[PDB]
Amino acid sequence: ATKFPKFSQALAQDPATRRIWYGIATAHDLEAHDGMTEENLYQKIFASHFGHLAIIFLWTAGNLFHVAWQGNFEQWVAKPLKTKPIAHSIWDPHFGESALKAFSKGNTYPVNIAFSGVYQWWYTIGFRTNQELYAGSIGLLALSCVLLFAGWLHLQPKFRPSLSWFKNNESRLNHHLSGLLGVSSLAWTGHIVHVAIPASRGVHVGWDNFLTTPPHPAGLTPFFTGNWTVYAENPDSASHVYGTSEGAGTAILTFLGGFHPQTQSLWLSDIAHHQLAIAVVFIIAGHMYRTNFGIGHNMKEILDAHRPPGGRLGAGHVGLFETITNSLHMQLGLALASLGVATSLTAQHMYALTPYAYLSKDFTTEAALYTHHQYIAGFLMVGAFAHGAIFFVRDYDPELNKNNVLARMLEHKEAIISHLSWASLFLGFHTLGLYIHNDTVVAFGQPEKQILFEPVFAEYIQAASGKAVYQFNVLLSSPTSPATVAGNQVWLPGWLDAINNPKNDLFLKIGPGDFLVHHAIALGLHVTALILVKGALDARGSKLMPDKKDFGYSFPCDGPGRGGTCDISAWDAFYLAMFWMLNTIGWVTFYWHWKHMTIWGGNPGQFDESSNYIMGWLRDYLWLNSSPLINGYNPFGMNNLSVWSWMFLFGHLIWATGFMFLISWRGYWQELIETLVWAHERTPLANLIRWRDKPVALSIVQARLVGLAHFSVGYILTYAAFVIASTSGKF
Amino acid sequence: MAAAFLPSILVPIVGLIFPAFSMALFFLYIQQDDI
């Protein structure tokens, strides 16, 4: 189509400003474009996947370039506990003279102090100099040149892959389990055995000497003879000075467990034996499926055969192979669902099992990394259910999926939704009821009347892994158990030392304040699931709109008739669950930060008493820790927290601006623009100029999206400004 | 910093000149009555 958007003839002939807005927000919905075939659709997705891969490696090359050029990595590897890691330098002409010296405190030029943790991660994987970081940024800069050429190349007519190549599920899983997962984990074991573990042992192994320097003194003959215990002979001592040869072992594959005592971080020989065992499992797992060589499973045959003969799942998993293979939205929704779990697991395990050297002593980075990946995991989980809802409108075939496990979810969708409605209401009635009870009795001067449930089930899990403070004496906190005896020969002396040390994050001491907030988190998980499940299961139709699949995924309403139908589309349940996602990740990261800021502050009993009621969260966490932030600038001057105090108010303003698009709706604004169009047509010397697109108000769905994006950006920027300036301002 | 002059050149290009160029080209492209 002429007159942009090229892909949509309907929007191309729109006379208003709606054309440019909707042309942007539909540019990547390639299945909805005019003249789109299925073979062209996969080839455009394949080539734009090469562009997204290049952007990731350009972004990683930029982090490496700016740290090598403008940062203090070589001063940080010399003194890791005293140096602040530099992100990049500041060149801002709007800076005053006192702002220039406020940001160049320990340096020559104004800098930003990095809270991404790339210093602690690059140091752990063996980087020591600025020249090594530069050569890494050049190689990623040329890798993303190759990925940009491959996206161009695989759109040329002789290199465009056929649709059958894109549908080859068995060969893709075989390679992606072996090559992408298992071989890369084997190769990463090759890096940390050859490069990273000598660098922690005070030995430089780079490209100049890695062919002539064996990573073990025995040197690869115990591997081929099967004498694999040679690689675990002498680990580093308990008095090994990290990065030096003093006290250093030679073992390359151990199962020590726990932490290196100086860095309070995982042993690199444990990570190497982890990655090597992960490599073998995935390489084996990539021998399951039937490619060109006759052996292997056919995935259509597995799904067709898995029907329980009791008939409680009706037809089983028949039809699910052709459902997934023909639905990119079901494939994307499965992929975002596992990535959301993998990103939550990343956050929950990186704080507790510290992988990088001196990462746990950087308090602001640990708060930034947990909050980053938990908000990423919230966005991925909402997108998984969103594309699960797009699948039911656009891709679900009710006749191919007849009485299988997919169709029977729609068959009992009222039972699923009303039981999620029960569990959401039960959690909210009693968690909020118990918090208000504890607020009321503490306000009336009687804190001994508080309802404080001890979280004994999770304390039992800590004691089952060896936590001794709850005196439960069950599995690994009991020296008579066969789990303790079989295990004490391997990792358990390192693990029991780590789990019973109260100055790390491995299984933090929990009490009744941790009870009530987990049931608030469970409330937030259940309601956010409820909106998203009702969004997917009612995506095709309800009693209020039985023909809803004819109208698509996103549409404004069905009008004021039949009582009124505002926000009836499945897109609108994504939109309502985004508020519940940010609230849920809000309650999660608030709980992580306040429990850590009282542990790092030396008063962990302040969390144990004040988290039982809401005023403790408002007074002792929000109001108390706001004090370094809001004094980033004041009438008496400013410091380097002044950017976070500005961003804090910047975040409050975007959040509130979102409320305007959220509360005011369209017909107010379209009438207001009509008088503005009149005023321009009747004003001389502005009558010389005219629009070429007729000014209209934003549409109903558009300002829902615009108000949500303002709400979300102001949500993120306010807490990022607060979680960083409170930890940096206190520590 | 090594080439300390380079932020004084590139930040006004990335912050002022390239957004002036790219917003003008997208404005010209969205008003074209042909493709």
Binding site: A54, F65, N130, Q131, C145, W152 | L6
Partner: peptide, 30 residues
């Protein structure tokens, strides 16, 4: 210690990556 020429080499490889991105972007647009 990064030198002046090492910054200039990275800018030339970056401006070639800008050409390859425009070539990928023009091919995706067609």
């Amino acid at each position: 210690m990064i030198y002046d020429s090492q910054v200039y080499i990275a800018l030339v490889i970056a401006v070639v990556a800008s050409v390859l991105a425009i070539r990928l972007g023009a091919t995706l647009y067609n």
